[PDB]
Structure 1
Amino acid sequence: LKDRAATSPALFNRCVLNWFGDWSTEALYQVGKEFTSKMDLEKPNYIVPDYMPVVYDKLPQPPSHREAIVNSCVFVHQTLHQANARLAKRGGRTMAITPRHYLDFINHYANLFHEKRSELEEQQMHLNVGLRKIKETVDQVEE
């Protein structure tokens, strides 16, 4: 921006600059909560012994493990930000991490979750089919 202004003074004359901050923890939590909705993260049995929020404001009550999943996703984004900061402080050549990284992470999570649930369900139904076949073989043996 320092030399962008020098090249074109009209950038601070006719253009009202609007600064977009990086997506806040609230924004990341909302994106994660909305996008991880087709996913079935509802586990009836779940216990929370500790207190580790990142959003800090909405639904701090004992979650349904879905709030916990989204909280962990936002923590992953924050942790990568701290990793970049520490890498820059103790050296150099760090790389900017954007909200598009968060969107790609959520898409990867959704797709991988779908694949790794579908494969287990199909192998379970194959196992049930095999059990039925073995029962049919037992019937033949009894005959």
Structure 2
Amino acid sequence: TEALYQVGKEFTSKMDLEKPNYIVPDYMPVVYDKLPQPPSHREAIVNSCVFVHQTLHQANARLAKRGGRTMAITPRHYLDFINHYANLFHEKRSELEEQQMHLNVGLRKIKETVDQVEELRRDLRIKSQELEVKNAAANDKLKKM
């Protein structure tokens, strides 16, 4: 269990895994016996990762008791789990930033569109006011006749 925890800590150090407002539950499901008593968010994530690996061992034992076919659980499975965790976290976060970037630009274009639409209201009335005086002056001069 200690070996799994140290592998998780070292490999997941690159990822953020930081929650400043993390709340420690009263009954923490402690898997790693050497986990700090007030565990951080990063430590909690690694603790869950270790628990996931030990879950498969219990699952395989359940099949053997029932008489089903079981496959060996090896550290390579744990390495695959953390590799997938690192890749999925980077992929999901990167897509979210790109998606929100495009949405932020799109909304900015919309708010500039409505602003220019309001600008057209002021342009329209200036054109209308100029038209009213133009025909009024044209009629007045055309009537000097």
Give yes or no for TM over 0.5: yes
In our comparison, the structure showing a higher alpha carbon Rg is 2
Q: 1:72 to 1:49 in 2, by over 3 A?
A: same
Matched residues in 2 for 1:126 and 1:92: separation? 51
Q: Give the CA deviation at 1:139.
A: 2.1
- Asked if the contact 2:4/2:50 (under 8 Å) is kept, the reply is yes
Identity of aligned residues (%): 100
Aligned-partner Cα distance in 2 for 1:104–1:56: 20
Aligned with residue 76 of structure 2, among 100, 111, 118: 100
Per mean C-alpha deviation after superposition, the further-off stretch among 127-136 and 43-52 is 43-52
The answer to whether the 8 Å contact 2:17/2:41 transfers is yes
Aligned equivalent of 2:101: 125
Offset of residue 92 of structure 1 = 3.0
Alpha-carbon distance between aligned partners in 2 of 1:137 and 1:107, rounded to the nearest angstrom: 45
Does structure 1 retain, via aligned residues, the 8 Å contact 2:31–2:51?
no
Specify the alignment match of 1:134 in structure 2: 110
Following superposition, the deviation at residue 49 of structure 1 comes to 1.9
1:131 is displaced (CA, Å) by 1.5
Q: Quote how far apart the aligned CAs of 1:93 are.
A: 1.4
Q: Aligned-residue CA RMSD in angstroms?
A: 1.5
Distance 2:68 2:96 in 1: 43
Tell me: CA distance 1:94–1:59, structure 2 relative to 1, closer, same or farther (3 Å). closer
Contact 1:42 1:66 in 2 (8 A): yes
Once the 2 structures are TM-superposed, how far is the Cα of residue 65 of structure 1 from its aligned partner?
A: 1.1
CA contact (8 A) 2:5 2:32 kept: no
> Are 2:18 and 2:41, in contact at CA under 8 Å, matched by a contact in 1?
yes
More helix by share: 2
Change in CA separation of 1:110 and 1:87 when aligned onto 2, cut-off 3 Å: same
SS of the residue 1:109 aligns to = helix
Segments of 5+ residues of structure 1 without an aligned counterpart are 1-24
Offset, 1:35: 0.5
Residue by residue over 1:40-71, the C-alpha shift from the partner in whole angstroms, topping out at 9 and shown as x without a partner, is 11011111223345454434222221111100
Tell me if structure 1 keeps the 8 A contact 2:57–2:73.
yes
- After TM superposition, the score normalised by the length of structure 1 is 0.77
CA distance in 2, matches of 1:53, 1:30: 18
Q: 1:69, 1:80 → 2: CA distance?
A: 18
Say if 2:52 is the partner of 1:39. Answer: no
Runs of 4+ more than 6 Å apart: none
Query: Cα distance, 1:133 vs. partner?
Result: 0.4
